[model samples]
Target: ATCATAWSSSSVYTNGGTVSYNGRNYTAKWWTQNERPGTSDVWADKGACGTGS
Candidate 1:
């Protein structure tokens, strides 16, 4: 997927939720809330979601 949906602070995400940040994609390994996608361990790297896509 494009992972165009930027990660949000106020939103809650369960396992498999995808988000984009700093031109990369991350998938939630488990439930996540109030955590930054790239800086936290709750999200697993999905890698290389290119800036434009």
Candidate 2:
């Protein structure tokens, strides 16, 4: 499946927001920023994705 935009530390994310990082997609559970995916409860893993947009 097509991946969401890459995660950016400078970007703020709210609930249901999506981002791609480290070849995987993640969805934000709540407001977050600078928190790394897979290392926090804020982001739920969606699955792997290609590097290209």
Candidate 3:
């Protein structure tokens, strides 16, 4: 059987370097230019923080 793929990618993973986002902020995972996460609890639970603005 396969285990569920829940993610809490906050504290692990080797740094792939960084990139700037929203201009002033930089991240090792500048995933903004990529398709954002879905607005579902499943996606949100994986640390895919969300906002409506």
Candidate 4:
């Protein structure tokens, strides 16, 4: 299955919710909003989403 889905900046995510942004994946540490995944401390970096993997 897919690792996750596209990120939603407006949507609230609880712990462990993974989403794709730009080209990387991130796992949420807690509730979040408008926090762009890879650039902030709130999101745990899961590396690149990759292509045709």
Candidate 5:
């Protein structure tokens, strides 16, 4: 089966910082700096999909 959903991003995360979502920790990217300004960390996805399921 195929499951799909739509959602938006949260501006509460810092650039290159990890965002806890679903179950994984996704690092905000450089481009996402606008989402959470005042950060100078490197780019890292940290974790994309669910960390564990």
Candidate 6:
């Protein structure tokens, strides 16, 4: 599947916001900023992308 925009540390994301990180898509669980997606609980992994399947 296609992925969302790459996560930006300088950007602010609220609940349900979607972003791409480390080849996967992640949805924000709550208001957050500067938190790395894969390293934080604020983001929920939505799985890999660009597989063309």
**Number of clashing pairs, model 1?**
0
Worst 10 residues of 3 by lDDT: 40-49
* Candidate 6 local lDDT, 1-53, one digit each (tens): 58888899889999989988777889998899888887888898977746443
Q: lDDT by residue for model 5 over 22-45, one digit each (tens)?
A: 433446554553332223353333
Give the residue spans of candidate 3 off by over 4 A.
1-16, 29-53
Alpha-carbon TM-score of each model against the true structure: 0.77, 0.82, 0.21, 0.71, 0.33, 0.80
Scored by Cα lDDT, where does model 6 land? 0.83
lDDT of 4 by residue, 1-53 (tens): 45567788778898888887666788888878877777788888776676564
User: Ranking under TM-score, best-scoring first?
Assistant: 2, 6, 1, 4, 5, 3
Which candidate has the highest lDDT of all? 2
Model 3 per-residue lDDT tens digits across residues 5-42: 22224533223323222222222332332332233222
Please list the residue runs of candidate 4 whose C-alpha ends up more than 4 Å from where it truly belongs after superposition: 50-53
Model 6: colliding residue pairs: none
Model 4 gets an lDDT of: 0.77
Better model by lDDT: candidate 2 vs candidate 4: 2
TM-score, cand. 1 vs. native: 0.77
Inter-residue clash pairs, candidate 1: none
lDDT of 3 at 7: 29
Task: Give the C-alpha miss distance for residue 25 in model 4, angstroms.
Answer: 0.9
List candidate 5 segments past 4 Å from native. 1-14, 33-53
Worst 10 residues of 1 by lDDT: 44-53
Q: In terms of lDDT, which candidate is stronger, 3 or 5? A: 5
